[PDB]
Write a protein that binds this ligand. Structure first.
Ligand SMILES: [Mg+2]
Ligand SMILES: [Mg+2]
Ligand SMILES: [Mg+2]
Ligand SMILES: [Mg+2]
Ligand SMILES: [Mg+2]
Ligand SMILES: [Mg+2]
Ligand SMILES: [Mg+2]
Ligand SMILES: [Mg+2]
Ligand SMILES: [Mg+2]
Ligand SMILES: [Mg+2]
Ligand SMILES: [Mg+2]
Ligand SMILES: [Mg+2]
Ligand SMILES: [Mg+2]
Ligand SMILES: [Mg+2]
Ligand SMILES: [Mg+2]
Ligand SMILES: [Mg+2]
Ligand SMILES: [Zn+2]
Ligand SMILES: [Zn+2]
Lengths: 25, 136, 80, 91, 101, 97, 103, 212
RNA sequence: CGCCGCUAGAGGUGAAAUUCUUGGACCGGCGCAAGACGGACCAGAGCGAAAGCAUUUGCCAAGAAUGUUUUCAUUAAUCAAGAACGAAAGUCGGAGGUUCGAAGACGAUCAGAUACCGUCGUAGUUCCGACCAUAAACGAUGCCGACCGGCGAUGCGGCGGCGUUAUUCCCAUGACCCGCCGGGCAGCUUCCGGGAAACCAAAGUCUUUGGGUUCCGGGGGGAGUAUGGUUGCAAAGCUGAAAC
């Protein structure tokens, strides 16, 4: 696994957790 | 028919466009103006196989057919213009031109001066292959 | 063992202006014998501005980067 | 004192009709309510009349301008093309 | 008249037929493009604001420039009140009720 | 580690070089990195020049030359047999005969 | 054109502090009737009636006319004052040569 | 069907004072109702290279012709433009030179206005060690102004007959070569292209004047 | 796209097909329209603080370097906080849409392909207004100042050379050739020394250890992640720990 795609999948997980916080503020 | 000229000693000229690509070879006979097509036989008109229409064996058959039709219609000499896919593709001609020039010079068809009028763009417009392009 | 105390004058001429010891200026003051009536004018060598005689109102030195090129061949002297 | 930080002139509306719509209306409200330099008398008295019409206070020379500015940039391009086609090859 | 002006001239308030006092391109901020003059068979192509290229006569007239008031549809109406005043100024064209409703 | 002092291309003073497309695989490569040569051929292969010389109208008064800027990239140039590999002491060399 | 424009602005800078000049249309009327004015400067966007009247008075009273290609705001900037001016009359230059070079 | 048995042959007459007036023979379908034979033949052009027109000059400097009309089974052509060959244009382009370009519009004496180009390459001197041979670009701007200036006072005061008679020995290129050596020794300055963009009138009387 | 001539195939491949065609494809000759793009000339060349910058001409201000017996008189170097630009991609308005082309749709290979090959094609790629401030933003090498080898070169200024060649002819710049000087992109050799070596005239003047100054590293993961603060319309950016 590339460091680039590890960073982008952790970025997608960060966006998912941000949407979870916006879903339950 | 007799056509253009009787009492030989003066040649009747025609422009022979040869468009060679990596997939097909065009031989085309026009007058000195540029509109009146005299004969036009491609590679696929002489070769049944689609992978062998770019072969130099297709060029011999197409050029002999065109040289036969030109001797039937009565024109003597040819000014050969040579061109390829030069807009964005490879500017070098394909494998058909090397055989087509020999097959025109073999059976009649006295050749005048040959000029390689190839369409060369100014400043390298956008290539079809993309970023990293052709692979294997 | 290079002799830095008493070097060669040709070597110190071929060196740069400020690298040498005394740091003497490479410029000079030249005497132009203007052919107008009689006047001889002292003028700096690397003349930045134009040089006009007050008597004949002719151009003596053209402004040129480096040193000033001259007019018709007036003489010049070196006084140091 | 800087009372408002983002709404500007649009704060007369309030909480209604969207942030992007208020942001897009902000620049053209500033454009229609700003005074412009009169090209004839040199003053800043170009007040907006009805839509498309500008009016200078001094010397009363009413001019037909853009709908929201004094000169549309497309109209300035049209004026440049008109003078180019005028002095190009004598009509 | 459009036969006098050269090609590419940006004009407005032009005419379909010669002598009807201005029909085409009359809305605010619109223009036509004059091209393709012909000495024989006196015609002229004009590019209209819809993008259509119409062949018209060469004797009809047109004022040079664009119509003032361009960019009028840049601002949103932003409420029902300005739409009510706009359509009350224009004509009763606003009983806009949904046909499914 | 470093394989080359020049790091492939010849960019030393400037910071950006315009990419020029390749010929075989058509990849945009900067021109100081891409293999840029200039092929000079006869317009007819030398085994077929004699046939046109025998069947020519003029008495050998025309001899055209075909000049093409050839522009390969180093990813396909090794496959295209131009830029073959060398030794560590052989990478310091110049224009081959 | 840089030589001509920077020359005109430098001559105005020198007349600004060296010589004596008058300002405004009503004062240039008295100066062009008394004949003290030698050169007048009109703005680009001055109105045509005032422009033709000042040109008529100058060509009756043997006075040069210079049309300054510029708005009256930058003409006031060129004469060096914060307001705007459309009509100048250089009645006495200090060390300049506006009334010598151009006419 | 055999349409070439029905097709007709017209021979092409070049205009005067090249050396001769022979070009070749072209195909005409025939005249049939609306399609007159003098319709497309007026629009047909030609593109011919030398050693047959200019009485044994160089093989490059091609010529672009266009047929004005036909007169007694002989279609008479007229000058349309002038080009050079691809191998000559791509030749004399060395990797260590400086290629100076120029182009200018100019009107002739009559109602013909044309657009002509100019190409120049640098020249290494005899016994020169420095292989670069570049310029300071101020002489390049000055020589672009110079080559734009020379073509004005040739082609403005001369119409087609005199400018073709000046392009017979390439006197424009030799004049630029003579007036060029004070700046730089530039190598084989040619014009490389000129084409006609505006044509005023048919002018059969001026064509008879071109015949003489 | 408009016409003209001929004709059964033309594109696309390792090989075929998806695509268009007697409703004329493709090919040649002429004209028009659209927008993108500045090759060859173009180089271990130049400029710019970097990102970056290549058709001609005009205008607008700017700057390096050089030549200065010209001017002021320590006005200087690096920088917490703060600020100006900042490739490409992405977001919000207005104009169109040439080519390419994320996604998407098929046609092929493959046991399996949605990928590598091909055909069509949206967003985008263009320009004008704003936002985002990121890269292998590289020379993986902070800035200023001195010293410590040579050589052949290149570009930019200055100087010298009854040397060579160009105008019409003394008068002056033009081009070549030889040498020197100032900073610059550079190359070869070397035991001058460093370093683990590759390699480096800097990555040297470091146990014989100290010229000034700014920022960061303390095994690998967790992790540039979580929680806070802050900027942004958003994607996200900056600061950024602990358990194990
Ligand atoms: Mg990757
Ligand atoms: Mg809208
Ligand atoms: Mg509705
Ligand atoms: Mg409703
Ligand atoms: Mg490796
Ligand atoms: Mg970079
Ligand atoms: Mg169909
Ligand atoms: Mg075609
Ligand atoms: Mg960007
Ligand atoms: Mg939107
Ligand atoms: Mg496509
Ligand atoms: Mg996929
Ligand atoms: Mg989106
Ligand atoms: Mg970073
Ligand atoms: Mg730093
Ligand atoms: Mg020099
Ligand atoms: Zn007013
Ligand atoms: Zn390649």
């Amino acid at each position: 696994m590339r460091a680039k795609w590890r960073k982008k999948r952790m970025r997608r997980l960060k966006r998912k957790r941000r949407k979870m916080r916006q879903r339950s503020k | 028919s007799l056509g253009p000229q009787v009492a030989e000693g003066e040649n009747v000229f025609g422009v022979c466009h040869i468009f060679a690509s990596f997939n097909d070879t065009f031989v085309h006979v026009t007058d000195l103006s540029g509109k009146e097509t005299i004969c036009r036989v491609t590679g696929g008109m002489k070769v049944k196989a689609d992978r062998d229409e770019s072969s130099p064996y297709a060029a011999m058959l197409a050029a002999q057919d065109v040289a036969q039709r030109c001797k039937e219609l009565g024109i003597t000499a040819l000014h050969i213009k040579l061109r390829a896919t030069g807009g964005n593709r490879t500017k070098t001609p394909g494998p058909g031109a090397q055989s087509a020039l020999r097959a025109l010079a073999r059976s009649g068809m006295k050749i005048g001066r040959i000029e390689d009028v190839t369409p060369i763009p100014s400043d390298s417009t956008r290539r079809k292959g993309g970023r990293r392009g052709r692979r294997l | 063992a290079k002799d830095l105390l008493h070097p060669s004058p040709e070597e110190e001429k071929r060196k740069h202006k400020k690298k040498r010891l005394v740091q003497s200026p490479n410029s000079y003051f030249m005497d132009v014998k203007c052919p107008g009536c009689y006047k001889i004018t002292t003028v700096f060598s690397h003349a930045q501005t134009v040089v006009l005689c007050v008597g004949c109102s002719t151009v003596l030195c053209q402004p040129t980067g480096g040193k000033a090129r001259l007019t018709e061949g007036c003489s010049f002297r070196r006084k140091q | 004192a800087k009372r408002t930080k983002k709404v500007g002139i649009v704060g007369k509306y309030g909480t209604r009709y969207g942030a992007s719509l208020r942001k897009m209306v902000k620049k053209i409200e500033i454009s229609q309510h700003a005074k412009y330099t009169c090209s004839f008398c040199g003053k800043t008295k170009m007040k907006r009349r009805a839509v498309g019409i500008w009016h200078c206070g001094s010397c009363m020379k009413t001019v037909a301008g853009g709908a929201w500015t004094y000169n549309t940039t497309s109209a300035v391009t049209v004026k440049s093309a008109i003078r180019r086609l005028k002095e190009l090859k004598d009509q | 008249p459009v036969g006098t002006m050269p090609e590419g001239t940006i004009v407005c308030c032009l005419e379909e037929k010669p002598g009807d006092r201005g029909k085409l391109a009359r809305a605010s901020g619109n223009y036509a493009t004059v091209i393709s003059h012909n000495p024989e068979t006196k015609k002229t192509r004009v590019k209209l604001p819809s993008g259509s290229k119409k062949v018209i006569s060469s004797a009809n007239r047109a004022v040079v420039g664009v119509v003032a008031g361009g960019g009028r549809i840049d601002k949103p109406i932003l409420k029902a009140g300005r739409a009510y005043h706009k359509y009350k100024a224009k004509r009763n064209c606003w009983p806009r009720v949904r046909g499914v409703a | 580690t470093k394989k080359r002092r020049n790091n492939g291309r010849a960019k030393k003073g400037r910071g950006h070089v315009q990419p020029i497309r390749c010929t075989n695989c058509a990849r945009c490569v900067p021109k100081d990195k891409a293999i840029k040569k200039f092929v000079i051929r006869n317009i007819v292969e030398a085994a077929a020049v004699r046939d046109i010389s025998e069947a020519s109208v003029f008495d050998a008064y025309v001899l055209p030359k075909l000049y093409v800027k050839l522009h390969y990239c180093v990813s396909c140039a090794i496959h295209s047999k131009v830029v073959r590999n060398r030794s560590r002491e052989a990478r310091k060399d110049r224009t081959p005969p | 054109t840089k030589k001509s424009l920077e020359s005109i602005n430098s001559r105005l800078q020198l007349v600004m502090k060296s010589g004596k000049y008058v300002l405004g249309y009503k004062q240039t009327l008295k100066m062009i009737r008394q004949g003290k004015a030698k050169l007048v400067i009109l703005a680009n966007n001055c109105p045509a009636l005032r422009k033709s009247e000042i040109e008529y008075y100058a060509m009756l009273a043997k006075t040069g006319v210079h049309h300054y290609s510029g708005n009256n705001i930058e003409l006031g900037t060129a004469c060096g004052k914060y307001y705007r001016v459309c009509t100048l009359a250089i009645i006495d230059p200090g060390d300049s040569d506006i009334i010598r070079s151009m006419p | 069907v055999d349409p070439f048995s029905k097709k007709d042959w017209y021979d092409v007459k070049a205009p005067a004072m090249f050396n001769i007036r022979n070009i070749g023979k072209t195909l005409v379908t025939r005249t049939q109702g609306t399609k007159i034979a003098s319709d497309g033949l007026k629009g047909r052009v030609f593109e011919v290279s030398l050693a047959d027109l200019q009485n044994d000059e160089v093989a490059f400097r091609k010529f672009k012709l266009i047929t004005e009309d036909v007169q007694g089974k002989n279609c008479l052509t007229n000058f349309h433009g002038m080009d050079l060959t691809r191998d000559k244009m791509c030749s004399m382009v060395k990797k260590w030179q400086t290629m100076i370009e120029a182009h200018v519009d100019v009107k002739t004496t009559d109602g013909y206005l044309l657009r002509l180009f100019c190409v120049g390459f640098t020249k290494k001197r005899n016994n020169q060690i420095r292989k670069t041979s570049y310029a300071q670009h101020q002489q390049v701007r000055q020589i672009r102004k110079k080559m734009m200036e020379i073509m004005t006072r040739e082609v403005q005061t001369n119409d087609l007959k005199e400018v073709v008679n000046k392009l017979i020995p390439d006197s424009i290129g030799k004049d630029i070569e003579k007036a060029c050596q004070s700046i730089y020794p530039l190598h084989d300055v040619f014009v490389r292209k000129v084409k006609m963009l505006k044509k005023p009138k048919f002018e059969l009387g001026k064509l008879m004047e071109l015949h003489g």
